Amino acid sequence: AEKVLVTGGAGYIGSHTVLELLEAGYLPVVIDNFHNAFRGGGSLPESLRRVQELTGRSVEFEEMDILDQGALQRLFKKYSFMAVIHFAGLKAMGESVQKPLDYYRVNLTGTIQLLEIMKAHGVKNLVFSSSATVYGNPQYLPLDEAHPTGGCTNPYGKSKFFIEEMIRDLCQADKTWNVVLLRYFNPTGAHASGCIGEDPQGIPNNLMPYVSQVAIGRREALNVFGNDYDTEDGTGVRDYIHVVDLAKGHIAALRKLKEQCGCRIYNLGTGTGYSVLQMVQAMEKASGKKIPYKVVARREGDVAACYANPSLAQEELGWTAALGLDRMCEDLWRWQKQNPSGFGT
Amino acid sequence: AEKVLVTGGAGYIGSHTVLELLEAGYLPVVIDNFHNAFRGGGSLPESLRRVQELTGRSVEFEEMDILDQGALQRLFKKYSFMAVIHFAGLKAMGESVQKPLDYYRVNLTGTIQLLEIMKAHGVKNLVFSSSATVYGNPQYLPLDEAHPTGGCTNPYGKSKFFIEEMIRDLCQADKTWNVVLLRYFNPTGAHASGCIGEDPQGIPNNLMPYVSQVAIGRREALNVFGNDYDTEDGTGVRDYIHVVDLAKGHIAALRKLKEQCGCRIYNLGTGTGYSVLQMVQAMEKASGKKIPYKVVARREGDVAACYANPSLAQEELGWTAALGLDRMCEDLWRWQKQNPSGFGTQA
Numbered sequence: 001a002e003k004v005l006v007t008g009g010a011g012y013i014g015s016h017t018v019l020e021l022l023e024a025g026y027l028p029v030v031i032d033n034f035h036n037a038f039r040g041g042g043s044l045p046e047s048l049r050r051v052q053e054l055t056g057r058s059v060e061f062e063e064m065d066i067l068d069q070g071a072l073q074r075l076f077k078k079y080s081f082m083a084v085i086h087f088a089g090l091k092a093m094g095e096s097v098q099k100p101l102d103y104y105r106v107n108l109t110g111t112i113q114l115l116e117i118m119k120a121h122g123v124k125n126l127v128f129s130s131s132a133t134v135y136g137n138p139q140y141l142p143l144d145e146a147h148p149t150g151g152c153t154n155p156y157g158k159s160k161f162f163i164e165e166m167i168r169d170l171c172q173a174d175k176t177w178n179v180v181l182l183r184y185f186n187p188t189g190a191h192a193s194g195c196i197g198e199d200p201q202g203i204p205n206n207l208m209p210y211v212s213q214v215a216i217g218r219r220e221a222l223n224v225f226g227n228d229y230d231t232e233d234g235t236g237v238r239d240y241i242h243v244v245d246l247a248k249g250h251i252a253a254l255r256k257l258k259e260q261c262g263c264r265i266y267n268l269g270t271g272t273g274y275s276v277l278q279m280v281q282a283m284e285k286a287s288g289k290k291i292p293y294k295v296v297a298r299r300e301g302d303v304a305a306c307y308a309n310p311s312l313a314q315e316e317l318g319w320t321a322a323l324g325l326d327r328m329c330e331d332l333w334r335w336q337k338q339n340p341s342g343f344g345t
Numbered sequence: 346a347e348k349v350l351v352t353g354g355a356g357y358i359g360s361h362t363v364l365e366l367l368e369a370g371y372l373p374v375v376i377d378n379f380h381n382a383f384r385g386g387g388s389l390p391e392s393l394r395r396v397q398e399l400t401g402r403s404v405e406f407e408e409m410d411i412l413d414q415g416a417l418q419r420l421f422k423k424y425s426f427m428a429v430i431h432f433a434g435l436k437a438m439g440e441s442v443q444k445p446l447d448y449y450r451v452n453l454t455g456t457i458q459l460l461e462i463m464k465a466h467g468v469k470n471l472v473f474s475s476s477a478t479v480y481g482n483p484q485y486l487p488l489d490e491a492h493p494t495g496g497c498t499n500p501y502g503k504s505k506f507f508i509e510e511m512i513r514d515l516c517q518a519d520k521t522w523n524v525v526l527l528r529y530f531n532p533t534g535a536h537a538s539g540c541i542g543e544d545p546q547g548i549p550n551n552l553m554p555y556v557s558q559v560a561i562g563r564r565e566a567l568n569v570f571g572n573d574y575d576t577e578d579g580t581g582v583r584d585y586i587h588v589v590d591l592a593k594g595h596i597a598a599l600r601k602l603k604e605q606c607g608c609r610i611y612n613l614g615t616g617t618g619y620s621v622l623q624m625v626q627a628m629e630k631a632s633g634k635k636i637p638y639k640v641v642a643r644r645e646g647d648v649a650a651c652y653a654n655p656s657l658a659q660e661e662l663g664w665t666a667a668l669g670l671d672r673m674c675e676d677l678w679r680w681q682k683q684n685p686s687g688f689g690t691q692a
């Protein structure tokens with residue numbers, strides 16, 4: 001009726017989105033099981049506790065797992081939701097290939113359970129966290145929504161594609177459902193306040209947090225996974241997108257659902273690709289620190305270059321990413337410098 | 346001393362497979378929730394009660410849903426399974442397109458749960474019921490295992506494809522798993538005793554049972570779904586395979602698992618395609634009755650022709666579909682004639 005349910009809202013993208021929702025006047029209800037979120041000193045996960053402080057608005061939260069039908073039932077009885085933004089899931093941490101069942105359980109079974117409860121309670125409006133990984137090895141660049149999908153390299157990406165397909169099927173079968181599938185490119189950056197940001201545990205698998213950790217002195221040097229691709233400089237190229245813009249894209253998705261759009265799919269990227277070395281350099285500039293690097297072997301399954309065609313999202317969702325490279329680096333640096341250990345110990 | 350778990354064992358293919366298993370010396374434990382199986386006068390589904398009589402061997406059975414985590418866990422705890430043959434699932438009554446979530450829950454989440462429970466109990470040998478539908482609209486024929494998969498039309502076929510992908514990944518990640526994915530073509534026929542067979546509830550959605558129902562005099566005429574396809578006679582072409590041969594292919598699969606085979610995928614078909622009209626004619630011959638029919642509109646999603654390339658199975662599985670068209674028709678007829686209304690509890 002009123003509320004927006006946000007699954008996995010304590011995570012990186014989700015917490016930034018909760019913040020945007022609150023500032024836009026929405027009332028979110030967040031759920032998370034702390035699988036990859038840090039527990040604050042109170043009820044709320046630290047990220048959310050900080051979002052509350054930042055917005056001066058309260059965060060309604062419930063600790064729970066999407067795999068728990070009982071809890072889902074109780075949740076859906078307690079609140080009247082008008083839409084669900086689904087961030088909860090396991091992300092490839094490079095782990096996927098080795099633990100397929102965990103991925104398929106959490107991402108597939110958990111999403112199906114969510115979809116079923118939504119259907120049961122008549123909440124047929126969803127915004128889903130998809131990924132450019134669904135396009136597989138790029139056939140052409142930039143990647144537009146019409147590029148082929150499926151034929152993924154890993155259990156994680158396959159999981160994303162399977163979910164998109166299930167949702168398409170659901171929308172076909174029941175014309176009352178509205179779903180916006182958002183294919184994120186490479187999220188980076190952090191809220192301008194520097195109070196929240198990505199909080200990886202252990203050695204980061206993604207570039208940016210590793211880069212930021214070298215700059216802060218936590219890591220000796222960045223290992224660059226190959227310099228022999230068919231890219232202007234030999235290193236992998238990606239469409240780095242500021243998490244704040246990404247979060248704002250979810251609000252635009254909400255408005256889209258109101259149009260009774262059925263199933264729509266949009267890329268959420270800037271359309272500008274940057275190489276590993278370019279990112280390193282920009283981080284040196286932002287941080288004022290040196291970021292030593294070593295060229296190592298190619299990482300299994302890595303693609304040479306991946307970047308988005310942002311046209312459709314601009315035309316249909318009315319959204320474009322506003323923040324550039326320098327801004328992403330400055331914000332990421334601020335978060336890292338201001339929070340040397342992430343959210344806590 | 347180790348058993349074989351048979352999920353969905355009370356159904357068409359499963360009952361036939363339980364019979365083959367019993368005859369070949371295996372010890373099955375069968376589970377079914379009666380979603381699409383008839384309850385016997387006793388605890389056993391009628392089909393399995395008959396299999397017990399036919400074989401003179403006991404059938405260990407538990408009424409249970411694969412979606413029931415607690416029950417499934419207790420089952421794996423109670424027995425020491427050496428392998429699992431997974432038949433349980435929803436097939437479609439042309440329904441899948443309209444109830445996607447049901448297919449995704451029962452087929453997809455049900456199998457993920459089964460695989461998790463299996464892993465947890467140290468059982469990593471699986472025989473999975475797949476289908477030629479995973480190939481989608483044929484890009485060429487005959488369909489060999491190398492033909493592209495995915496790109497299916499309905500939720501049912503998508504579920505099967507997603508399951509195959511999941512198992513392939515599992516095997517890739519853990520070399521200790523062994524899994525045989527069998528892509529069945531169009532199973533037909535019945536055990537030669539005539540005591541068991543396909544037992545549809547209501548108007549049959551598949552060809553053969555409808556034809557037999559007409560031949561027995563229950564139905565007026567066969568409705569032929571389109572006659573304008575690009576095939577010899579305009580009617581759809583399919584690779585019909587005798588359920589007994591299909592069932593025996595499961596025994597071959599268990600043998601394959603014992604070879605520490607990893608993930609293997611095999612078509613289970615005869616390699617010979619027959620049209621709708623050719624099947625009617627064969628049924629006329631078996632039944633000794635004229636079988637009328639009327640041509641109606643095309644059935645949404647139907648492919649023109651589909652048939653297998655059965656060489657890989659012959660070679661690697663050491664299995665071949667022995668029974669021909671007449672046998673299939675004669676066996677189907679015997680079952681239908683001796684059991685005009687399908688299964689019923691004992692008198």
Ligand SMILES: NC(=O)c1ccc[n+]([C@@H]2O[C@H](COP(=O)([O-])OP(=O)(O)OC[C@H]3O[C@@H](n4cnc5c(N)ncnc54)[C@H](O)[C@@H]3O)[C@@H](O)[C@H]2O)c1
Nearest residue numbers: 008011012013032033034035036037065066088089129131
């Ligand atoms: N970060 C990326 O580069 C990226 C790229 C593409 C798509 N995505 C997708 O976007 C979504 C959010 O990504 P993120 O970077 O914010 O990751 P994240 O791990 O920070 O956020 C996911 C949140 O979900 C929660 N969660 C996990 N399993 C849960 C369960 N069973 N029940 C309830 N909560 C559960 C975690 O505790 C975490 O707080 C995910 O679906 C991710 O796969 C992210």
Ligand SMILES: NC(=O)c1ccc[n+]([C@@H]2O[C@H](COP(=O)([O-])OP(=O)(O)OC[C@H]3O[C@@H](n4cnc5c(N)ncnc54)[C@H](O)[C@@H]3O)[C@@H](O)[C@H]2O)c1
Nearest residue numbers: 353356357358377378379380381382410411433434474476
């Ligand atoms: N019949 C065909 O032409 C065909 C073709 C391709 C693949 N397959 C597959 O082979 C398998 C067997 O098909 P069949 O023709 O014997 O179908 P069937 O319906 O006779 O057999 C399936 C059995 O599974 C049981 N079942 C369903 N949901 C269950 C659940 N949640 N828990 C436990 N048991 C459950 C049903 O009661 C039934 O006895 C199915 O997975 C089917 O999709 C069949």
Ligand SMILES: O=c1ccn([C@@H]2O[C@H](COP(=O)(O)OP(=O)(O)O[C@H]3O[C@H](CO)[C@H](O)[C@H](O)[C@H]3O)[C@@H](O)[C@H]2O)c(=O)[nH]1
Nearest residue numbers: 092093094133205206207210223224225236237238276302
């Ligand atoms: O320590 C690192 C990390 C990354 N990179 C390079 O930086 C680029 C971006 O790498 P990320 O890992 O941040 O992101 P990806 O776009 O390559 O995404 C891939 O890696 C993600 C993080 O591992 C997820 O696993 C995701 O499923 C998978 O598609 C790539 O060219 C990568 O080779 C390095 O050189 N060194």
Ligand SMILES: O=c1ccn([C@@H]2O[C@H](COP(=O)(O)OP(=O)(O)O[C@H]3O[C@H](CO)[C@H](O)[C@H](O)[C@H]3O)[C@@H](O)[C@H]2O)c(=O)[nH]1
Nearest residue numbers: 437439531550551552553555568569570581582583621647
């Ligand atoms: O009453 C019937 C039934 C079938 N047929 C035709 O007979 C052939 C075999 O049809 P079946 O339904 O027995 O088997 P299929 O292999 O064609 O499978 C198709 O039907 C399945 C069950 O009927 C599912 O619907 C599946 O999605 C779909 O591909 C097809 O050419 C079909 O058009 C008829 O003319 N009339």
Ligand SMILES: [Cl-]
Nearest residue numbers: 099100101102
């Ligand atoms: Cl696993």
Ligand SMILES: [Cl-]
Nearest residue numbers: 269310320321
């Ligand atoms: Cl953009």
Ligand SMILES: [Cl-]
Nearest residue numbers: 444445446447
């Ligand atoms: Cl549904």
Ligand SMILES: [Mg+2]
Nearest residue numbers: 654655656657
């Ligand atoms: Mg061959």
